[PDB]
Amino acid sequence: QGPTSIWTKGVTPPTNFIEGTDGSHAPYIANQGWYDITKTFNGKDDLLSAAATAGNMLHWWFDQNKNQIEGYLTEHPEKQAIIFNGEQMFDVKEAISTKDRQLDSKLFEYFKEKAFPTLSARRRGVFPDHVIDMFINGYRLSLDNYDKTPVKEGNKDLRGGIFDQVFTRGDQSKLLTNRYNLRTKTINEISQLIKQELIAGKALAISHTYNNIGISHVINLWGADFNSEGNLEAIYVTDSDSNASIGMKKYYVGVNSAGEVAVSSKKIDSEHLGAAALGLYTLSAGQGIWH
């Protein structure tokens, strides 16, 4: 009969929550284990919600794997930088140094400027698991694939494969990502999945319907509140579309009038149907796998 709460491994719950114009938010504080990559809307990042979300999860991943990554980069120093012909496009140490920045992290800068510079202009986006599977394992990110990454040997995507000397292509046990359909699932099914993935020590992203830019939006899910019945009541999220001053938002979770498990900055109501939950993406730290 008590309302229990569960946070992502290595994240300090914010407590600075203030009433805003639409719902409760906790402005971002550095070095608390969560991340809030924020779009500038510069032409290039406008439709990269998924790449921002993947970036936030990769920032979290850098924290989980700090020692393992510094070990790896000494054993394989050629994997530190990415070069296209003559030019250094990316340096992973630069990404790690700048991981605390909402607006000007080198990781999101790489994504919007070098990896996916044309996708926004072409009214196109990505899936956050594809971005991670590219960045870590070197799996080729295809604009034609709307399902999971095909787990098969193949050429390193030139835009990534930094950790592909440990997290190889075509080996299921070295795949760190997963995705789950939430559409038409019950509050109990969605709640147990999110519970399980959080207690398992995964980073989480959730997609919901969007009544604007695209049709779906993906955000980072850092924490959840579960009621007396074990069902989600609220989630704590960062949203790349929210300006840098917002930070962590509290969304109510419930079953709306239309029978959808929905998220809303306001309590689910006869007057507030929120946005339908569509998908869940997870990232493992992969701590079994190093060495």
Numbering used by the authors: 46 to 336
Reproduce passages from the article.
In this work, we describe a novel protease of S. canis, termed IdeC (Immunoglobulin G degrading enzyme of S. canis), which may be involved in bacterial immune evasion. We demonstrated IdeC is a cysteine protease that cleaves feline, canine, and human IgG between the hinge and CH2 regions, defining a new virulence determinant for S. canis. The structure of IdeC presents the α/β fold characteristic of the papain superfamily of cysteine proteases, consisting of an α-helix followed by an antiparallel β-sheet comprised of four/five β-strands. The active site, the canonical catalytic triad for papain-like cysteine peptidases (Cys-His-Asn/Gln/Asp/Glu), is situated at the interface and involves residues from both domains.
To enhance crystal quality, a truncated form of the inactive IdeC was produced in which the first 48 residues were removed (IdeC_T48_C94S). Crystallization experiments with the truncated IdeC produced new crystals in the cubic P 21 3 space group that allowed the structural determination of this variant at 2.25 Å resolution. Comparison with the IdeC_C94S structure revealed a high degree of similarity (rmsd of 0.376 Å for 229 Ca atoms superimposition), although notable differences were located at the PBL loop, further closing the cavity and blocking the substrate binding site in the IdeC_C94S_T48 structure. No sulfate ion was found in the IdeC_C94S_T48 active site, which may account for the different conformations of the PBL. In the IdeC_C94S_T48 structure, the PBL is stabilized by polar interactions involving the main chains of His253, Tyr255, Ile260, His262, Ala320, and Ala321, as well as with the side chains of Thr254, Tyr244, and His262. Additional structural differences between both structures were noted in loops 63–69, 186–194, 226–231, 301–304, and 309–323 and in residues 125–137, which form a small β-sheet (β−3 and β−4) in the truncated IdeC structure. Minor changes were observed between residues 86–89, 160–163, and in α−2. Similarly, we conducted crystallographic experiments with the truncated form of IdeC and the IgG-Fc. Unfortunately, only crystals of IdeC alone were obtained.
